[PDB]
Structure formats: C-alpha cells, structure tokens
Write a protein that binds this ligand. Structure first.
Ligand SMILES: CCCCCCCCCCCCCCC(=O)OC(COC(=O)CCCCCCCCCCCC(C)C)COC(=O)CCCCCCCCCCCC(C)C
Ligand SMILES: CCCCCCCCCCCCCCC(=O)OC[C@H](COP(=O)(O)OCCN)OC(=O)CCCCCCCCCCCCCC
Ligand SMILES: CCCCCCCCCCCCCCCC(=O)OC[C@H](COP(=O)(O)OCCN)OC(=O)CCCCCCCCCCCCC
Ligand SMILES: CCCCCCCc1cc(O)c2ccccc2[n+]1[O-]
Ligand code: SF4
Ligand code: SF4
Ligand code: SF4
Ligand code: F3S
Lengths: 60, 37, 397, 291, 449
C-alpha cells in the first residue's frame, strides 16, 4: 500500500512541478506524458522509501 | 493472524488521534506553504 | 516420460507447422524468409544459452532450485551444437552465395561490397571503417568459436553430471564442474555479448550499445526461467519430483523469474534513459525506429504486459508457490519475450507495424518447437534430478 | 573535427553548399545529415527568436568583442595564477587553431566561440535546480541568483563556454572598479556559473521599449526591429563578423545570413540546434600560387 | 570448509560477541585507543580542510573550466560505492538464502552507513554554494521554484536520501534484538536504559519473530532494487551527459559491479584485522574469506567486461571523439591512471582464481588494497580524463589536484574510521542473533545428516 502511495506521489510531484505548476523548457524535453523517462528514478525511490517505512513502522 | 493490540478499546481512539494529528499537521503545513504569503 | 513425449510431439508439430509456413513464405519473399529467420534464431537461442548460463550459475551457487532444474538446464544446453548447425542459413545469407538463394542484396549491411569498399555505389564510411571486424569471414569465425566454446562447456558439464550419477565420487565430481562453471560464467558473458553484437546489432552498424548483449543475457535468462517454470509444471507428476521436490524450488524459481523480470526492465530502461537524456544523433535513430510507425504501441505493450503485469502478479507469495499460476504467468511471460524480441529485431527489417509478415511469426514458433523437441529428447535420456549429488540435501529443506 | 570549415571562392560561386556537402560526404557518405532527435523542443513560429551569425571569413582576431563583452557584462579579472589553474573568465573566446599541411608555418584560423543558446541545451538538462532554462524567445537563461554550483552545466556543455566563479573573483573593495561595473548587469559572487547571454540587458531593454511603444500607439502587438538590438560584441566588432537579429523575421540580416549555404552550426551530431551558427571561411587563392 | 566452527553454544556466542562492547572504558584496549587516536587526528584534518573550503571556496581544489568535476566527485563515487557490498550482504544474501551473511552483515552494513555518511557530505562539500543543498530537494518556498527532476542530480538527491534512510532503518531493525541482548547482558543500571530504549522491549517473542522475519525479508526485497537503483543513478549522473567518455550505456550495471567490487575489497580489508584481533575465527572463517574473494573475483570480472565494452565501443565506433577518448586514456597526460587501473583491476584478479591465493590472508589484504587503489583510478579515468579533452580542442586543459582535496580525502578516511571505531566500541561487530540461529540451523542440518 505505501509502495503504491510512494510511487504515485513520486510521479505526481514531478508531473505537477515540472509540467503543471511551473512549465519550464529545459533541454527541449517534452512538457507532457512523453517526458515519462526522467520521472521513473524519483518515482521508484519514493516508492522504495515509503514501502521500507511501511515495513519498519508496520512491523513495530 | 491477529495483531498484538487486537481487542483493545484504546486502538480506535489512538488511530483517530494519529489521523487527527496527521490531518491537522497537513492542513497547517498547507496553510503555511500555500495560503500565508 | 509421458509428459516429455507429449511436449516432444507438440514441439515436433509446432516445428513442422513453422517450417512449412516459413518455406511457403520463402517462395513469395526469399529476402523476408531470411529476415524472419534471423529473428527466429534470436528468439530460439534464448533457451539454450540461458540454460548453459543458469547451469553454471547454479553450479557456482548451489540451491534447491538448482538441483531441481539442473538436468533440464543440461538438456537445454546440450542442444547448442544443433543451434550451431542451424546458424548455417544466416551465414549463407551473408556470404557471397546470397544470389543463388533468391536473396537479392546481402543479409547484413557489411556484407555489401558497394558499402564496405571505396568507390562503390553506397560506400558508407562507418561500415567501411568496421570492415575487418564486421566481415563475413571474421563474423563466421567468431560465432563458430562461440559455438565450440558453448558446445564443449555444455557437453563437459553434462558428461560430468552423468558420470557423477553413474559412478564416481559425488563430492569430487562437483568441484570440477564448479571450477568449470567459474571460468565459464566469464567466458559465457563475453561470448554471449559478442554473439548478440555480431548477430543483432551488426544489422545496423550506424548504432552501437554496450549494455546490449547483457540486456540479451537478461532477456535469455528470463525466457529460459519461464521456460523452466512451464516444464517444471509439466513434469510435476513423474515419480522423481513427487518425492524429492517440494514447493521451495517452485518458490525459488518464481522469485528468480520476478527478479529477472525486474532485471530485464532495468537493462531496457537504463539504455532508454541514457539514449533519451543524452540526445546524440548516433544513438537516437534506434528509438526513433522503435517508436515510429506503430512501434510505440509495441513499446507500450512491453511497458504494460512485460513489466507492469508480471511485476504485480509475481509480487504475491501465493502466485509463485503454485505451479499452475506460475505456469500461466510463465506462458504470458514467454509471449511477452516473443513480443520483446519482435520489438528489438523486427524494426530493422519491416519499418512499420503493419508490414509484419506471417514468416515473422512462423520462424520463431517453428524454431522454438525444434528447441522444445531437442530439449525433450535430451531430458528423456537422463534422470530428472541428480540423486548422487552433494547438494541433494538442499532439496530436503 | 569539423569546427573551422574552409572553402574556396570559385567552388563557392559554383555551389555555396559544397563545404557542408564535402564534410558530410566524408563523415556519413551522404550530402545532408539526417540528424534525428528524441526531444521535440519548442516551436518558434510566430515569436521573436534571437540568434547570432559569426562570419569566419571576416574575423581577424582582434579581441575587441571580448573586451566589449567584459566591459558590458562585468566579467571579473582573475589572476595569472588563476588562469594557470585554468579558470579564466571570458564569455566569448577567440579560438586560434593553426591548421595546415605544415605546422612549422600553418594557416591561422580565428573563431569567436560564445554560448550558442542551444534550443535543446545539454547544459539545461543537467541542472538539478533549473538554474539554466530556456526562454520563450529562445535564450538559455543562466540565472546566477538560482545557480548553486554543482558544476555540471559546464561538463554537459560541448563547447565549454560556461565560466565558474571558483573563488571571489569579482572585486568587492575597489571603489573605482565598483563604479566601472555595469548597473544593469549583475556582479557575480563566488560559487555561481556565468556564460554568454546574447546581451540580454539590451534584449530586455529593447523588448520593454517595443512593448511600451506598442501600448502607447495602441497596436496591441510589439515589433522589435532588426537594428533594435545590437549586442556588445556585434557593436564593437570592427569588421562586422558578428551579426545579431531575429530568426523568425525573414527580412532580418541574421536570417538572410543563415539562409546562406555556408552557414553551419558546431557539433550538429549532438542534437542541440545551435542559434549561434557560423559562416564557413571562403578563401580566394590565386592560380599562380596555390591553384 | 564451514561457515561456523564447531564448539559453540548460544550462551558462548552471546558472551563472545557482547563482551567486546559493554566493557568498562578503563578496560579499553590500547589497539583501539591508537586506532581511534589516528582516526581523530585525521578527523581534525577533515575539520581543517572543510573550514578552509568554506572560508575560501571550491577554487582551492584543482577543478577548472573543462574539468569541473574532479577528485571531489571521484571520492564521492568511491565512498558511495563502498556501501554496496554491505547492502548486498544485508539484503541480497538474505534474499538468496546464503548462510555466510550471518557473521559479516552487521559490520558490513555499519561500513555502508559510514561510507554513505562520508559520501553524502561530498555533494554539499563540492557544491560551491554549500548552504543551498536544500534547493535540490523539493521543498516549499515563496518563489514557486522546483528542482528540474530531469537531471540525474535530483535523482541522486532522492537516491542518496532513500539509501541512507533505508540502510539506517534496516541496520536498526537488525540491531533491535542485539540491543535486547546488550540490555540483558549489561551490568550498570544506567547503561541498561541505553540499550533498553533502543530495543523497545523486544522479548524474543515467536509472534514478534514472525513479523520480524517478514519485515526483514521485505526490507531485503526492497533494498536490493534500492541499492541497484542508487548505483545506477550514480552511474547516470555521468551517463545522461553527452560527454564522450560518459555517454556509455553499460554504466548502470558497470557501476553496480564496480561498487560491489570496491565494497568487498573494503569489507575484506576490514574483516581481516577484526577477525585476527577479536576472537571471531569461529564466526568469520576461512570459508567466509574464500566466498568474499569469490564475489570479488566475479564482480571484478564484470568490471573487466565493462572495460572491454568501452574499448570495443571506441574501436567499433567511427566516431573521432570515441577514438580520441581511447587514445587519450592510452597515451594521454593522464594515462598513468588508465595503466595503473589495468594493472590493479585486471592483472591483480587473476591470482583470485586460485584456491590457495583465495585462502591466503596477506595476499587477500594486498589484493583488496590494490583493488581499492585501482577503483579510485577507475573513477579518475571515468571523470577526469573524459572531462580533460572534450569536443572542442581549444577547451582542453589538464586537471592537477591540489593538496586540499587530498586533505579532504584523508579527512573523510578519518571520519569513516572514527565512526567505525565508535561502532566497534559501543556496538557488537557481528550479529548476536541469526548466528545462534545459524548454529541452530547447522545443528538441524547435522541432525538431518
Ligand atoms: C525500471 C524500474 C524497475 C522497477 C523495479 C521494481 C522492483 C521492486 C521490488 C522490491 C522488492 C520487493 C520484494 C519483496 C519480497 O521479498 O518478496 C518475497 C515475498 O514476500 C511477499 O509477499 C512480498 C512482500 C511485500 C512486497 C511489496 C513490494 C512493494 C512495492 C515496491 C515499491 C516499488 C514501486 C515502484 C511500486 C519474496 O520475493 C523476493 O524476495 C524477490 C525479490 C527480488 C529482488 C529483485 C532484484 C532485481 C534487481 C534489479 C533492480 C532494478 C532497478 C531498476 C531498480
Ligand atoms: C547484485 C545486483 C543484482 C541482484 C539480483 C539477485 C537476485 C536477488 C533476488 C532473487 C532471489 C532468488 C530466490 C532465492 C534463491 O533461490 O537463492 C538462494 C539460493 C538457494 O539457497 P538455499 O536455500 O537452497 O541454501 C543454500 C545455503 N544453505 O542460493 C543460491 O544459489 C543463489 C542464487 C544465485 C542468483 C543468481 C543471480 C545472478 C544475477 C545476475 C545478473 C545479470 C548480470 C548481467 C551483466
Ligand atoms: C542468462 C543467465 C544469466 C547468467 C548470469 C551470469 C553472470 C552473472 C554472474 C554470476 C553470479 C554467480 C556468483 C558466484 C559467486 C560465488 O561463487 O559465490 C557462491 C556463493 C556461495 O557459494 P558456496 O558457499 O561457496 O558453496 C555453495 C555450493 N555448495 O553463492 C551465492 O549465492 C553468492 C552470490 C551472490 C551474487 C553477487 C554477484 C552479483 C554480481 C553483481 C553485478 C550485477 C550487475 C547488475
Ligand atoms: C539531502 C540529500 C542530498 C545529498 C545528495 C545531493 C545530490 C547530488 C548533488 C550534486 O550536486 C552532485 C554532483 C555530482 C555528483 C553527485 C551529486 N549528487 O548526488
Ligand atoms: S571583434 Fe570582431 S573581428 Fe575582432 S575577434 Fe571579435 S568577432 Fe572577430
Ligand atoms: S552553448 Fe553551452 S551553455 Fe549555451 S545553451 Fe549550448 S550547452 Fe548551454
Ligand atoms: S552577445 Fe553580448 S554577452 Fe554574448 S558574447 Fe557577445 S558581448 Fe558577450
Ligand atoms: S549544473 Fe546547474 S546548479 Fe549551476 S553550476 Fe551548472 S547551472
């Protein structure tokens, strides 16, 4: 549950921040869902972080 | 299997206390970082 | 033995059907016959190379799954001389005998004298720069050396395992195959990477990738792991796996399948993000060709059904503890590996999603049916598990 | 490498694209390069798109553009020890190149290299805080208030035009130098990256003037003229090698120079689409001596 | 051989591991005192170097306009790659069901945490404006600014923060019943509460052991792709660039292999004095050293394969920049790094195939030190040589490191050893549980014959 929450939050934060809240042209890279690379690492790290927090705090 | 605190009458009061603390802290952070200026 | 005969006749029938449809398509397009045969060879080599690779990995790192699937790995890896015999149509495609076989312009771009010689019609200078390395003689010598290495390695490991089963010290004839596996993992990695280079990436010499070949290793590993899950589900009632094999080798096999699904999408995504973020025109035409003309739909299907579906159905404990669910997931996975090698190889010939012929599905199905029949005939010659092995105690759990 | 492109006059008269045709024929075997990118970029179809065209045939190497850029943009003077460490601060450099068939007497090839303001900027992609972004007008925006070191913009810049304040290079105590500083350009502190901005003080001043004139006349649309922006290097060039103007305006001098066949950009295989393009040097040799 | 020597009981394991901590500070060994004095002197060197860096600037180093990343980034990748093997022993060996993790995982995960602690300062230290590291973090501000998130350094922010946090969490989870054992074995009533509040009343309950084993399994199965993603992202902060030495697509598994290589080099180089100075020959065995050197040989072979991939890419490409990258590495002004790299990562690993050399202790120490030096040379070759000579030959210069980045490197060595000596003073070097459980498992294996 918290891994899904972390992956969703890590994608949504990058999407809103780079694409909705502040659309910036950097490197000519896309301003839509075509910018789905360079969102996967922070998405995955957020999912891993909240899933490991879930494992620890949920066990305790 | 059941959890350790299953059957304890304090479990739902402490869950409502934790969720109330989380929503108050979330709303307060949202107020400070979005509606404060 | 009944299920082995059933899968042997199933693979024989699938091979007959695939070779018949491929030979029917050869008379209408002899070029596309060989272009589909390259893709079929690339698909059908994922099983024996992966069987040799996990045979050496389980010999180095012993396990209950390793002694469960070890004889299947030996039977799969023993088909590699026949794969060396089946590479001959590709070699005759890129030799000078292409005119006698109906193929009008040679099978690889570096077999063109007009491309690799100065003063020719095309004279691509990059391909002409790679003229000693990417030549028919050097490529045939390299792939033949690789076949010799694979065949000697697999035959020595299988012969040592059969000698261990028949007569001799089980502990002494385990260190020998562990040492042979220790040198053979390094030889296998460099050999399979250069084989994948010279077979797949040598179609378009304008583009190079160094994670390629190891990505093919992850692809072949996932393909033969799902193959092992399907065969392990098929032979679950054979009076040898009923007594000595429990659910823990099944759990280990499912965990390995999940781990190498994650590893395959890792090796695909790393290459994709490197080429996408570093916008160099030496590398971006690969993903342009793999995105244009409907190939973006196949890429999205690889995102959705080769990673997002097996990652979520293999994340649960019960779906890998059950052989029926593991076999269904493994069948979906090998279908998605067929789609993945299609997305990798077929943009080099077809250029469009709607330009895919029936030879492109006849060649890998028939040639993997040949792989099925050869593997079943090889595993029918031996007991399914190494009873006289030091690592037999790992099956007791 | 295809950086300084040299041609002859008679073959230029026959066909002005033959320099690029010969370069790409030797490199790829085809007359034109089919450079393919995975990034879309921006559009630039109805907007003021700014670019530079440097004429290598008309550059002598007098460094007047470099001194003008320093004077206009407050580029700090570092020590001789700091240049020996490799940390010179110059937004435009003149790259002498000594190419010839004998290096004991070669031909001298001078070329001004500033920031190309690349539409797909490798400096822009690798900035972790978006301190360097791209304009609606088409300029790379090196923001010093935002720049936080990390020195990666300079490692992903293929031309290495970006200069980093490794120490406190700008003078803080000399009142005469403080008076010498341009009030309309910032003075950079230690720890920030600086590079060529197409004199965006003048770009912003002319854009504000054009918008103010547009609303004072009621036109509801600002037009910036071709001579309205003149950068410091373009102004102080005694030869006129550097020309600055609008790309989307076809009647502008930069668009007319970029419509020439010998116009080219540096390192096109890196899909950057440079806006500072170069005109190849066209020589005029005599038949009694060379030909 | 065996991973546990015979003649051990559960109480003997508990006493022999927990009696090296919980000793009075007046009974502290002189070897520990001398090592901590050396570590504290080099930590004073760290403080002096960091203070002079913050006073003067990042211009005290040798970095310049073409080479903007130098010894700071080399030591960053080196120190962050030390921790991969400890994360591997803590997580991947738990996933694989390998019984040799039970006596090396505590020290190796502590080494991972201290190496990440040393390598997390290096972004902030090299940053040039060090007090604005939080602008790379997505935080709410009055500007409305965001990090780019398309750069690999934002992924590095997320990956380093997640790696440090999950590594510390998994280490503390693996310490909680060891905290219970120390709380039980303590003598003074005031040091009972030091480990009591960290054990949280563990009780050793079988209901608690089920949830503990499930949490450890899921933490291992989350930390394996975590550590692979962290070292892939640290590969990507070169591999997303257009630099000819850096736009190489085998860098994520190549950096994973190099990090595991250097990590087990440092792990062997710090097990061997711990094994010979504490009574841990029964726990850390010759089989442990043999299998750690086997993983060193395997991962070093993968790094040698990565060298062959880069050389093949340079020779196979018709690209003049790849050809000159190979020429510059072979015969450049910094070709000493490439040649010493080839000697220290290719020649020195062919002895590790041999069983006698694998079992030999001083040969293992020499090989581990040579591999650490050659991995520093590898990161030098990747960063500095590729940044030295670039596309435009006018922008070519030589990177000469000063005394200050060397002083910072020596100081981070001192910080690492200070944290390690504090860890071996107040905490057990090896896991008290899961080694008595390993003894129970070996007893069950002997009963099953
Ligand atoms: C290009 C991006 C690729 C995305 C990679 C995704 C991989 C993440 C996997 C995390 C490991 C969890 C396994 C738990 C476990 O130990 O499983 C047990 C069975 O016990 C259970 O019932 C499961 C416990 C809870 C599982 C829930 C996981 C939460 C979701 C993760 C959040 C991520 C986001 C993105 C959703 C037994 O199974 C195993 O032990 C198998 C472990 C396999 C390890 C895989 C190693 C591959 C290394 C390559 C890494 C690739 C790079 C790109 C990350
Ligand atoms: C290092 C970065 C990548 C890590 C990925 C590794 C995969 C981790 C998750 C997979 C779990 C596999 C299931 C568990 C298992 O079967 O392994 C334990 C196994 C059996 O142990 P017994 O229980 O039988 O008892 C023995 C001791 N009492 O032990 C093994 O044999 C280990 C299996 C070897 C794994 C092979 C993975 C190699 C990764 C290759 C990656 C490709 C590189 C391409 C360049
Ligand atoms: C197509 C198929 C894929 C093939 C992949 C081949 C390339 C991968 C390398 C092979 C990995 C095998 C590791 C062998 C190391 C070893 O010998 O250790 C063995 C240990 C324990 O063995 P024991 O105790 O001595 O005896 C057992 C028999 N009685 O077993 C292990 O499980 C440890 C292996 C841990 C794997 C870490 C290495 C991973 C490489 C990192 C780079 C990967 C890039 C992503
Ligand atoms: C709060 C955690 C932030 C610490 C990590 C910062 C990330 C970071 C920032 C940088 O400027 C880098 C420059 C070169 C190489 C790596 C870098 N990393 O990782
Ligand atoms: S001032 Fe003009 S002629 Fe002189 S170096 Fe600059 S661009 Fe060339
Ligand atoms: S020339 Fe350099 S600094 Fe300017 S936009 Fe291009 S990469 Fe960035
Ligand atoms: S255009 Fe202006 S800022 Fe750019 S190099 Fe020329 S003088 Fe300097
Ligand atoms: S990478 Fe970015 S943070 Fe500054 S130094 Fe370069 S613009």
């Amino acid at each position: 549950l918290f891994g899904l929450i972390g992956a969703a939050s890590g994608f949504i934060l990058q999407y809103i921040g780079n694409l909705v809240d502040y659309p910036l042209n950097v490197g000519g890279r896309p301003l839509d869902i075509t910018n789905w690379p360079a969102m996967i690492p922070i998405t995955f790290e957020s999912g891993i972080l909240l899933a490991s927090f879930a494992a620890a705090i949920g066990m305790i | 299997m059941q959890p350790e605190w299953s059957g304890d009458p304090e479990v739902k009061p402490v869950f409502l206390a934790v969720t109330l603390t989380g929503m108050v802290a979330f709303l307060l952070m949202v107020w400070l970082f979005a509606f404060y200026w | 033995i009944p299920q082995l005969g059933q899968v042997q006749m199933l693979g024989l029938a699938a091979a007959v059907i695939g070779i018949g449809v491929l030979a029917a398509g050869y008379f209408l397009s002899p070029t596309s016959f060989f272009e589909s045969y390259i893709y079929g060879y690339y698909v059908a080599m994922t099983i024996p190379l992966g069987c040799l690779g996990f045979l050496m990995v389980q010999h180095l790192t012993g396990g209950a799954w390793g002694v469960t699937v070890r004889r299947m790995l030996e039977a799969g890896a023993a088909t590699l001389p026949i794969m060396g015999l089946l590479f001959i149509p590709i070699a005759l495609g890129y030799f000078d005998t292409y005119k006698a076989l109906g193929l009008e312009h040679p099978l690889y771009e570096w077999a063109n004298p007009e491309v690799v010689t100065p003063g020719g019609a095309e004279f691509d200078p990059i391909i002409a720069h790679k003229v000693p390395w990417l030549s028919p003689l050097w490529v045939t010598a390299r792939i033949a050396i690789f076949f010799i290495i694979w065949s000697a390695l697999a035959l020595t490991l299988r012969a040592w395992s059969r000698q261990q089963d028949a007569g001799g010290d089980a502990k002494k004839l385990a260190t020998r195959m562990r040492r042979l596996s220790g040198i053979g993992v390094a030889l296998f990695v460099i050999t399979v990477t250069f084989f994948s280079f010279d077979v797949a990436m040598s179609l378009d010499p304008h583009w190079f990738s160094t994670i390629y070949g190891a990505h093919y290793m992850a692809n072949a590993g996932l393909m033969t792991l799902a193959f092992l899950a399907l065969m392990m589900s098929r032979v679950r009632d054979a009076a040898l796996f009923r007594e000595y094999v429990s659910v823990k080798p099944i759990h280990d096999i499912g965990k390995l399948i999940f781990a190498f699904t994650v590893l395959w999408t890792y090796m695909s995504y790393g290459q994709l993000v490197i080429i996408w973020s570093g916008d160099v025109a030496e590398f971006t035409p690969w993903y342009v060709h793999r995105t244009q003309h409907g190939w973006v739909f196949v890429a999205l299907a690889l995102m959705l059904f080769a990673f997002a579906l097996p990652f979520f159905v293999l994340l649960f404990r019960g779906t890998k503890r059950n052989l029926n669910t593991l076999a269904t997931i493994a069948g979906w996975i090998v279908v998605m590996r067929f789609v993945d090698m299609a997305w990798i190889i077929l943009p080099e010939f077809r250029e469009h999603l709607w330009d895919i012929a029936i030879t492109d599905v006849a060649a890998p199905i028939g040639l993997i049916g040949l792989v099925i029949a050869l593997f079943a005939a090889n595993v029918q010659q031996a007991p399914l598990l190494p009873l006289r092995d030091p690592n037999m105690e790992q099956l007791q759990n | 490498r295809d950086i300084y492109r040299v041609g002859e006059f008679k073959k230029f008269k026959e066909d002005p694209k033959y320099i690029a045709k010969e370069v790409y024929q030797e490199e790829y075997g085809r007359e034109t390069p089919n450079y393919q990118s995975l990034q879309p970029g921006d559009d630039y179809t109805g907007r003021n798109a700014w670019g530079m065209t440097i004429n290598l045939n008309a550059c002598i190497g007098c460094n007047a553009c470099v001194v003008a850029c320093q004077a206009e943009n407050n580029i700090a003077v570092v020590g001789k020890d700091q240049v020996s460490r490799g940390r010179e601060m110059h937004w435009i450099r003149i790259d002498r190149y000594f190419a010839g068939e004998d290096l004991d007497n070669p031909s001298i090839y001078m070329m001004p290299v500033n920031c190309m303001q690349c539409e797909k900027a490798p400096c822009e992609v690798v900035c972790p805080v978006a301190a360097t972004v791209h304009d609606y007008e088409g300029l790379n925006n090196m923001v010093y208030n935002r720049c936080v070191g990390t020195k990666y913009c300079s490692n992903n810049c293929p031309y290495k035009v970006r200069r980093f304040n490794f120490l406190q290079y700008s003078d803080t105590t000399t009142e005469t130098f403080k008076l010498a500083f341009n009030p309309d350009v910032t003075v950079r502190i230690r720890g920030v990256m600086e590079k060529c901005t197409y004199c965006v003080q003048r770009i912003s001043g002319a854009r504000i003037a054009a918008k103010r004139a547009a609303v004072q006349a009621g036109q509801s649309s600002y037009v910036i003229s071709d001579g309205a922006i003149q950068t410091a290097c373009e102004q102080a060039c005694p030869t006129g090698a550097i020309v600055f103007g609008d790309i989307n305006d076809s009647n502008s001098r930069v668009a007319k120079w970029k419509a020439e066949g010998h116009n080219y950009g540096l390192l096109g295989f890196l899909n950057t689409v440079p806006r500072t393009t170069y005109l190849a040097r066209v020589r005029n040799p005599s038949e009694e001596l060379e030909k | 051989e065996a991973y546990l020597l015979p003649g051990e009981t559960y109480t003997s394991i508990s006493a022999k591991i927990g009696d090296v901590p919980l000793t009075p500070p007046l009974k502290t060994p002189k070897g520990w005192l001398a090592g901590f004095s050396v570590a504290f002197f080099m930590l004073m060197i760290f403080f002096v170097s960091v203070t002079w860096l913050f006073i003067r600037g990042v211009g005290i180093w040798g970095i310049n306009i073409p080479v903007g990343w130098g010894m700071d980034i080399i030591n960053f990748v080196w120190w962050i790659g030390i921790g991969h093997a400890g994360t591997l022993i803590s997580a991947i060996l738990l996933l694989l069901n390998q019984g040799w993790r039970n006596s090396i995982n505590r020290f190796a995960e502590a080494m991972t945490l201290f190496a990440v602690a040393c390598a997390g300062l290096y972004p902030i230290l090299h940053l040039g404006r060090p007090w604005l590291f939080y602008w790379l973090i997505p935080y709410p501000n009055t500007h409305g600014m965001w990090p780019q998130f398309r750069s690999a350094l934002a992924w590095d922010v997320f990956a380093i923060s997640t790696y440090a946090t999950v590594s510390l969490v998994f280490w503390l989870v693996g310490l909680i019943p060891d905290f219970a054992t120390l709380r039980d074995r303590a003598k003074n009533i005031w040091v009972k509460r030091l480990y009591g509040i960290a054990a949280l009343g563990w009780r050793g309950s079988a209901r608690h052991w089920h949830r503990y084993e499930m949490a450890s399994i899921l933490l291992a199965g989350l930390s394996t792709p975590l550590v692979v993603s962290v070292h892939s992202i640290i590969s990507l902060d070169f591999a997303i660039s257009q630099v000819p030495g850096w736009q190489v697509t085998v860098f994520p598994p190549y950096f994973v292999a190099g990090a595991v290589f250097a990590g087990f080099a440092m792990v062997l180089l710090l097990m061997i004095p711990v094994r010979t100075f504490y009574g841990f020959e029964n726990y850390i065995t010759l089989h442990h050293l043999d299998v750690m050197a086997k993983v060193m040989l395997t991962t070093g072979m993968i790094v040698v394969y990565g060298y062959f991939m880069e050389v093949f890419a340079s020779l196979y490409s018709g690209n003049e920049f790849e050809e000159y990258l190979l020429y510059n590495r072979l015969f450049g002004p910094s070709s000493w790094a490439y040649w010493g790299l080839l000697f220290c990562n290719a020649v020195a690993i062919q002895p590790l195939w041999f069983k006698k050399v694998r079992q030999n202790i001083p040969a293992l120490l020499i090989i581990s030190l040579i591999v650490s030096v050659g991995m520093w040379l590898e990161r030098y070759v990747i960063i500095v040589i590729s940044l030295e000579r670039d596309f435009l030959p006018s922008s070519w210069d030589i990177y000469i490191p000063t005394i200050w980045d060397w002083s910072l490197y020596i100081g981070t060595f001192g910080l690492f050893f200070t944290l390690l000596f504090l860890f071996i003073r107040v905490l057990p070097m090896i896991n008290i549980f899961e080694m008595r459980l390993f003894l129970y498992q070996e007893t069950e294996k002997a009963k099953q014959r």
